Every structure is written in C-alpha cells, then in structure tokens.
Amino acid sequence: LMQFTLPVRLCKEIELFHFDIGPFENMWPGIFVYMVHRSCGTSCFELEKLCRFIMSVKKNYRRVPYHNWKHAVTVAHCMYAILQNNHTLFTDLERKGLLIACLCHDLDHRGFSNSYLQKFDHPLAALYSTSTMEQHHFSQTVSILQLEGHNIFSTLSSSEYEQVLEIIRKAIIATDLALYFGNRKQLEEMYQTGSLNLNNQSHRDRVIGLMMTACDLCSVTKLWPVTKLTANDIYAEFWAEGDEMKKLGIQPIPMMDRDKKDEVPQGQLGFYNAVAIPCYTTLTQILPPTEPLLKACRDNLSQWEKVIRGEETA
Ligand SMILES: Cn1ncc(C(=O)N2CCOCC2)c1C(=O)Nc1ccn2cc(-c3ccccc3)nc2c1
Numbered sequence: 001l002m003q004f005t006l007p008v009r010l011c012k013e014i015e016l017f018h019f020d021i022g023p024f025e026n027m028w029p030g031i032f033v034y035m036v037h038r039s040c041g042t043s044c045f046e047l048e049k050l051c052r053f054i055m056s057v058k059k060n061y062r063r064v065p066y067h068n069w070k071h072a073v074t075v076a077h078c079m080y081a082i083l084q085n086n087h088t089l090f091t092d093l094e095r096k097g098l099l100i101a102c103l104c105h106d107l108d109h110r111g112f113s114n115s116y117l118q119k120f121d122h123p124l125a126a127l128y129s130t131s132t133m134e135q136h137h138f139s140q141t142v143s144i145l146q147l148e149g150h151n152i153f154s155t156l157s158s159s160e161y162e163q164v165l166e167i168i169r170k171a172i173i174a175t176d177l178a179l180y181f182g183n184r185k186q187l188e189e190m191y192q193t194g195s196l197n198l199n200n201q202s203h204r205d206r207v208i209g210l211m212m213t214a215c216d217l218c219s220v221t222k223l224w225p226v227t228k229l230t231a232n233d234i235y236a237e238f239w240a241e242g243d244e245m246k247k248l249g250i251q252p253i254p255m256m257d258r259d260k261k262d263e264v265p266q267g268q269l270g271f272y273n274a275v276a277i278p279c280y281t282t283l284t285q286i287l288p289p290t291e292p293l294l295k296a297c298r299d300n301l302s303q304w305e306k307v308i309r310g311e312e313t314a
C-alpha cells in the first residue's frame with residue numbers, strides 16, 4: 001500500500017479540534033485524504049477516483065473571501081476531529097458520507113445569503129424556495145458525483161448509495177443556520193426529558209445536523225489569532241452583501257453594513273451568546289469528547305469581551 005503521511009507537527013496537531021490547515025493550498029487535498037484514510041479506512045475509496053473527485057470539488061468553489069475551498073477543508077477537519085473522538089458511535093456509511101458532505105457543503109457559493117438571492121429575485125430562489133443555496137450545494141455535489149470517473153461510491157449497492165446520498169443531502173441542508181435554531185431546541189428537549197435515542201434514525205439525523213452546525217461555525221473554536229483573522233473574511237462577505245442590498249434600495253441588517261464596523265465586537269458577543277455557546281453546549285451534552293470545542297468557544301467569548309472593554313484591539 002501507499003499510505004498518506006504528514007510532517008511531524010501536522011501529524012500531531014491535526015488530531016486537535018483547534019488545528020488550522022495552514023496557507024499552503026496545495027497541501028489541503030493530501031490533508032483531506034489523510035483524514036479520510038484514518039476516519040473511514042484506506043479501502044473506503046479508490047485513491048484515483050477520490051483524488052479526481054477532490055480536484056473537481058475544488059474547481060467548483062469560487063474565489064470569495066470566506067465561503068471558499070479553505071472553508072470546505074476546515075469544516076471537513078472539524079468533522080474528522082468529532083468522528084475520531086467518538087469512533088464507536090457512527091456507522092460505516094456515516095463515516096463515508098460525512099467528510100464528503102463537509103467538503104461539498106458550500107459548493108459554488110458566491111458569498112451571498114439566501115435572503116439576498118430572494119430580494120434580488122435570483123433564478124435559484126424560484127427553483128429552491130427554502131434553504132436556497134443549500135439545495136444548490138447538494139445539486140452541485142450530485143452533478144460532480146455523476147461525472148465520468150467520479151463515482152467514489154461505486155462499490156456500494158444501489159440501496160447503500162441511496163442511503164449515503166440521503167446522509168449527504170440532510171447534512172448539507174442542516175448547514176442552513178435558519179434550521180439550526182429549531183434543531184437545537186428539539187435536541188435540548190430530547191436530552192433533558194431523556195428521550196434522545198441514537199437507534200432512532202430521525203434522532204441520528206438531528207445529531208448529525210447539530211454536528212454540521214458545529215463544524216460550519218468552527219472558526220469560533222480556534223485559537224484567538226485564527227478566530228480574529230477569520231472574522232475579517234466573514235465581514236468582507238457580509239459588507240459586500242450589504243453594499244448589494246443598498247444597490248437594490250433596501251436597508252441592510254447591521255452585520256452587513258460596513259459603516260457599522262465599530263459595533264462588530266458587540267455583534268460577536270451577541271452571536272456567541274445566541275448561537276455558538278448553545279450549539280457547542282448541546283453538542284457536548286450528546287458527545288462529551290467534543291468538550292474542547294465548547295472550551296475554545298468560551299475562551300473566544302472572553303476575548304471579544306476584552307475587545308469591548310478596550311484591553312484588546314480589533
Ligand atoms: C464567527 N462566525 N462564524 C460563522 C458565522 C456565521 O454566522 N456565518 C453564517 C453566515 O455565513 C458566514 C458564517 C460567524 C459570525 O460572525 N456571525 C455573526 C452573526 C451575527 N452577527 C451580528 C453582527 C453585528 C451586529 C451589529 C453590528 C455589527 C455586527 N455580527 C455578526 C456575526
């Protein structure tokens with residue numbers, strides 16, 4: 001066999017939840033294959049088909065500040081850390097499906113929200129009335145899988161292929177943050193009444209949904225310098241969208257208005273309190289070994305509070 005290896009520092013640090021994949025774009029495909037080989041197995045995929053698939057996915061991400069190829073591999077790495085620290089809890093098909101779902105989950109993103117596509121009257125909004133971009137990301141995933149020499153699931157039976165594509169579809173749709181609020185509330189009630197049952201497929205779907213949110217938002221779980229610099233890329237996109245809202249004659253929401261730049265630290269505090277902390281809190285309740293995501297999120301909350309008090313500059 002030809003086994004994938006990483007340099008000593010990457011081999012050690014890739015196992016940490018707060019790993020950053022670095023600025024060398026040409027190393028990310030190898031980092032992804034390494035993670036697939038360790039979390040799934042060296043026999044899960046034909047290396048030639050997987051490599052061809054990876055390079056086609058990369059080509060269908062756009063040169064946008066945040067929703068780019070680096071984001072796809074970063075979200076895949078957070079899923080790798082969750083799977084490796086909870087290895088007894090997931091099925092063979094879920095391992096095969098979830099790293100692929102993460103790599104593909106923002107395919108052909110143009111850096112605009114579902115709200116903007118609706119207000120613009122983009123053709124995608126007519127095709128997909130809810131979770132507009134997320135239905136598009138899944139459609140793009142299916143298109144790539146159906147290219148000649150790209151069927152990475154070719155050894156699966158018809159029924160197994162259908163199951164893994166359903167795992168991928170549900171996981172990608174769950175990254176619509178509008179759906180997260182309802183999903184987390186249901187999981188919180190299920191955990192607190194002790195009704196949560198991982199033998200129940202409808203419950204497994206919700207747990208995978210929350211895992212996808214946790215991976216998608218994982219910038220808030222990095223070390224402070226990574227968290228702060230990633231926020232710059234997020235706002236680059238938000239403020240471009242705000243500009244486009246103003247061109248349509250619509251007042252943008254505060255987070256999309258570049259003239260409100262000085263309110264970002266208080267905006268971050270609001271986001272950590274309303275979304276991030278509850279997300280990682282509920283995930284740690286269901287999957288205790290994901291504790292390091294919540295610890296790092298609480299640490300960054302404390303950093304944004306220091307910025308607000310004028311002890312940190314951003
Ligand atoms: C870090 N992080 N990681 C992922 C995401 C995220 O939400 N994504 C989904 C949309 O696609 C990008 C990722 C964020 C984030 O910063 N969210 C937010 C959420 C709400 N806000 C309100 C304000 C704000 C308010 C008033 C004035 C100025 C700013 N600023 C924010 C930032």
Ligand SMILES: [Mg+2]
Pocket residue numbers: 105106175176
């Ligand atoms: Mg998305």
Ligand SMILES: [Zn+2]
Pocket residue numbers: 071075105106175216
């Ligand atoms: Zn994303």
